[PDB]
Design a protein around this ligand. Structure first.
Ligand SMILES: Nc1nc2c(ncn2[C@@H]2O[C@H](COP(=O)(O)OP(=O)(O)O)[C@@H](O)[C@H]2O)c(=O)[nH]1
Ligand SMILES: [Cl-]
Ligand SMILES: [Cl-]
Ligand SMILES: [Mg+2]
Lengths: 164, 438
């Protein structure tokens, strides 16, 4: 691989961030991993995507600034729960402060559409104005692979420490 | 939502986060709380606007800060200046716990020592040792023979000791054996052993010997200097270990003050804490002094730290992107040394073209600002100064009576060796067994 994109997952606890990671990389589903990787080729270039997870640190707003260090891309994840959706406002402000970056928004758990709170209509409008792309996903329906890859395509347009 | 833990930790200073990370790795259930909205505790790295908040009367206008300093996101400014010894115990902990995964490092360009108005690069190798104008030919010869003994000495082999006894000889006698002049003593004691006064001269050699050897080993590990410095500032360190804790099951609460410490009915022993998020309980607590002021005592020492922003490299450093300055006390009629720790945009701690020069010493007059004048004059023109005084606290007790294991305040030393000493000491007090690195 000739390019390495560090991308981070954010948003409220419970949404599905951990599962969206294990889906896109390991095609698995739980009912925790530090980070998982996946390589794609874009314009003949091998791109490793390093996708970091929160270790549950988002629960009481304890995400380290170091989590965003050198991150060239990021996904905000909401839930079935308008609470998380409204909280997506918070994580946007968090990210542009600590990162550098290309951002995308995802509405996970679309498989449970029979318990929907706040429709697709608003989520698209919310995304369209705020310059970040949208993709309604489900980790169990699955727009998982599309969402991650769509983000990776977009980052591709953008472009001595010592070991102990 | 959990309420019962094996360990509660308060404050996200480096000391606490290392212990948290170690205990979580050990398989303990750790709850770590900070009343502040960011990680680092007393030794965090902060933004330029935060510096104005903490140390200045009013903030600075948007256009003044914009034209002079650029964007606040480029600024990660250490509140307490420290480097890491390259062969020191913190690097050893970073390797074993693999926190090296969360932090990148660069080597400090060199160390410089003040002598009669000018600074001099401490020789890092033989080429530099030959060229150096610090000492004369016979002085260099005598010290060469001294440092050869440092490296060839073996504890359990008495035939290598050249008649010296680390425990029964003072360092002055070690010096005496090798014929060393007072100026060569000052160099060794202050530039290599990193003592901040001459008390060591009349004390058993063993501590001086250990520090000197650590110096030599640290410079040998990679070259150039004994020192490393983290990209994005010292604040990356606690955050690294906190992340280790979380991965290993630790729970973290920022911006969560302690409403009340709970104590066992009749013993005074720790029971838990009340917060806005609820009540949490543990058989014991680890905390910095700010959480238990009544259970700490003052060491008697106050430390002035002056953060200086510069538009230019430090004069007489060959445009070094980082360095350490050592001003021995006898060069100033002082009781203790003055340090300067200098880093730049090479370390992602300030915006392009700036340098951070942090001057510290232990205060000994009623005018701390004037005490620092000698060091101010070494830096060239200074864009801005941020002045802060801190008092050094330490626990009254070891925690065996109340289960309140308190850390010491970050001291005036130039590196983290005394911090990792605290860690090992606290770990033993908390677990009953010495720290074994996996
Ligand atoms: N039905 C359904 N459940 C999900 C989905 N994603 C996550 N979950 C469930 O939500 C719970 C917590 O999700 P998690 O991956 O930990 O989200 P996180 O807290 O943001 O990391 C788990 O028990 C999952 O089974 C989904 O797409 N559909
Ligand atoms: Cl160190
Ligand atoms: Cl000499
Ligand atoms: Mg998760």
């Amino acid at each position: 691989y000739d390019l390495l994109f560090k991308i981070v997952l954010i948003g409220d606890s419970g949404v599905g961030k951990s599962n969206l990671l294990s889906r896109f990389t390991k095609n698995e589903f739980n009912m925790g991993v530090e980070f998982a990787t996946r390589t794609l080729e874009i314009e003949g270039k091998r791109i490793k995507a390093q996708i970091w997870d929160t270790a549950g640190q988002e629960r009481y707003r304890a995400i380290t600034s170091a989590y965003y260090r050198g991150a060239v891309g990021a996904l905000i994840v909401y839930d079935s729960k308008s609470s998380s959706y409204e909280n997506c406002n918070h994580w946007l402000s968090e990210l542009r402060e600590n990162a550098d970056v290309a951002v995308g928004l995802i509405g996970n758990k679309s498989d449970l559409a029979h318990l929907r709170a706040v429709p697709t209509e608003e989520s698209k409008t919310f995304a369209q104005e705020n310059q970040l792309l949208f993709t309604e996903t489900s980790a169990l329906s699955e727009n998982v692979d599309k969402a991650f890859e769509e983000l990776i395509n977009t980052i591709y347009q953008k472009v001595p420490t010592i070991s102990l | 939502i959990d309420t019962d833990y094996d360990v509660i930790v308060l404050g996200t200073g480096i000391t606490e986060c290392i212990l948290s990370g170690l205990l979580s790795v050990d398989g303990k259930k750790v709850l770590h709380i900070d009343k502040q909205d960011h990680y680092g505790g007393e030794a965090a790295s902060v933004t330029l606007s935060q510096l104005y908040e903490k140390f200045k009367q009013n903030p600075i206008s948007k256009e003044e800060r914009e034209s002079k300093f650029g964007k606040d996101r480029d600024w990660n400014v250490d509140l307490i200046p420290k480097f890491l010894m390259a062969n020191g115990e913190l690097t050893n902990i970073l390797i074993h716990t693999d926190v090296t995964r969360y932090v990148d490092f660069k080597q400090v360009s060199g160390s410089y020592v003040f002598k009669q108005g000018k600074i001099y690069k401490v020789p890092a190798n033989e080429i530099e040792a030959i060229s150096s104008p610090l000492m004369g030919i016979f002085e260099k010869r005598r010290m060469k023979k001294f440092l050869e003994w440092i490296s060839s000495y073996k504890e359990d082999d008495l035939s290598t000791h050249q008649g010296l006894d680390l425990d029964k000889n003072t360092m002055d006698e070690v010096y005496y054996k090798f014929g060393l002049g007072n100026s060569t003593k000052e160099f060794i004691g202050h530039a290599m052993a990193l003592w901040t006064n001459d008390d060591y001269l009349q004390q058993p050699a063993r501590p001086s010997f250990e520090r000197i050897l650590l110096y030599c080993q640290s410079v040998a590990r990679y070259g150039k200097s004994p020192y490393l410095y983290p990209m994005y500032g010292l604040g990356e360190l606690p955050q690294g270990f906190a992340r280790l804790s979380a991965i290993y099951g630790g729970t973290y609460m920022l911006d969560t003050p302690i409403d009340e410490v709970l104590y066992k009915k009749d013993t005074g022993k720790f029971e838990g804490v009340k917060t806005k998020l609820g009540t949490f309980k543990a058989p014991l607590v680890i905390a910095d002094p700010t959480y238990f002021p009544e259970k700490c005592k003052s060491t008697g020492q106050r430390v002035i730290r002056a953060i200086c922003i510069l538009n230019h490299p430090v004069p007489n450093t060959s445009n070094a992107d980082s360095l350490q300055i050592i001003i021995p006390q006898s060069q100033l009629g002082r009781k203790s040394d003055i340090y300067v720790a200098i880093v730049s945009d090479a370390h992602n701690v300030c915006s392009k073209g700036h340098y951070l020069a942090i001057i510290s010493t232990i205060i000994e007059t009623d005018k701390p600002h004037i005490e620092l004048e000698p060091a101010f004059k070494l830096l060239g023109p200074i864009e801005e100064k941020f002045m802060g005084i801190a008092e050094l606290f330490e626990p009254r007790e070891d925690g065996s009576k109340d289960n309140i294991y308190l850390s010491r305040s970050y001291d005036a030393s130039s590196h983290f060796e005394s911090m990792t000493d605290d860690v090992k000491d606290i770990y033993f007090r908390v677990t009953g067994h010495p720290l074994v690195l996996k």
